[PDB]
């Protein structure tokens, strides 16, 4: 199981058009409580959110830490029956941890330890964004700006549709 589930809820990513974004949650926000449920880990957050929805709560208070103050925001409780979520995720830096042999990324010489800065002239801060851009590639070549030991390198590669994942794949795994 991923180790963030037992870690504190420090926001690394805010999904676009998500409840989280609408009410102004930012990366760096530390979620500490929701309604009457203490949130010490990502797992607590997940469980509280599901509990509230199933008990029929529509709106509740979300308690954040931001620059050492508590912020109180009213949020719509996501509808778990529709699979709806809050729209936050922990930080995963776009750093390559693994490269599948034979893959498009392997072929163009991407190596573990590379930092992906930019996809198709669009700066990215997280692995989710890389994934998003690959999903949206339409199987057409994508350009990546990479940082390797402080040096800027340009790469261009074509995503393959992968039957296991049901979507485009370039062959990169993030560092944990």
């Amino acid at each position, epitope marked *: *199981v*991923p180790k963030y589930l037992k870690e504190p809820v420090v926001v690394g990513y805010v999904q676009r058009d998500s409840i989280a974004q609408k009410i102004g949650i930012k990366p760096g926000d530390k979620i500490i409580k929701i309604n009457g449920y203490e949130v010490r880990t990502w*797992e607590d957050l*997940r*469980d509280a959110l*599901i509990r509230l*929805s*199933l008990d029929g709560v529509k709106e509740t208070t979300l308690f954040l830490e931001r620059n050492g103050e508590v912020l109180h925001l009213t949020i719509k409780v996501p509808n*778990v*029956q*529709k*699979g*709806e*979520e809050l729209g936050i995720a922990p930080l*995963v830096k776009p750093v390559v*941890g*693994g490269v*599948k042999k034979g893959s498009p990324a392997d072929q163009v010489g991407i190596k573990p330890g590379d930092l992906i800065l930019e996809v198709n002239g669009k700066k990215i801060n997280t*692995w*989710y964004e890389l*994934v998003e851009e690959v*999903r949206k590639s*339409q*199987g057409k070549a994508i350009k990546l700006k990479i940082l390797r030991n402080g040096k800027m390198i340009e790469k261009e590669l074509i995503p393959a*549709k992968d*039957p*296991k*994942t*049901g*979507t*485009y794949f370039i062959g990169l*795994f*993030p560092k*944990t």
Partner: antibody
Amino acid sequence: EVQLQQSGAELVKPGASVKLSCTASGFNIKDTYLHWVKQRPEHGLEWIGRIDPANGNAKYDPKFQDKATITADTSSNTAYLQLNSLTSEDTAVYYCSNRQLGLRGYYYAMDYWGQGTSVSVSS
Amino acid sequence: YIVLTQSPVSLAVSLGQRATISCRASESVDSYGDSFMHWYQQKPGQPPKLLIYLASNLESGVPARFSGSGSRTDFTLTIDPVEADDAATYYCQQNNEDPWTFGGGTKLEIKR
């Protein structure tokens, strides 16, 4: 919102063929695969096959390779399942489906099913 | 092809208590540090619904009382506590290798 909408129930006679359809909303089939699953009355689930709508490449379970034919139309966002040379073992509910998954480091699941299409093979 | 043998075939669990369903694969289903094995719930007259994917990950909205564990050839779905809504047939499914296969199903009865 994502939907897979399947055509209505079919009564067909043995020996013949039928064509079932699945129409997708809220996503482009061209970016993924559509799958077909068979479920006979009182039985479990059996994977028939998938198609890549971008290149018409369809893959089957060898057992269905010749009794099922899967096609897709990207302009109308629709996948089809053709069953030929129908026997009574072909009588079942047929499901179209899509799944997409994020891996270690970025886990997510997109999983959608049509409501199923009942096919009765009878004289 | 990968045979998936699911056990038990049927069971009756009291509201509040633990359900355990196992899936055995004829060959491994791991690749690059993930197991390509998933669990579905199928209610009567409804399409399957994903619960757990890649052995251990909860689908959006699925309660934590559902968990999946295992790797390689040996996998378990745990339902603890079981609730009224869990009355259904459960299936493991693998897609590490073509063709995709389902287990035979496990029918869960709820004791009330």
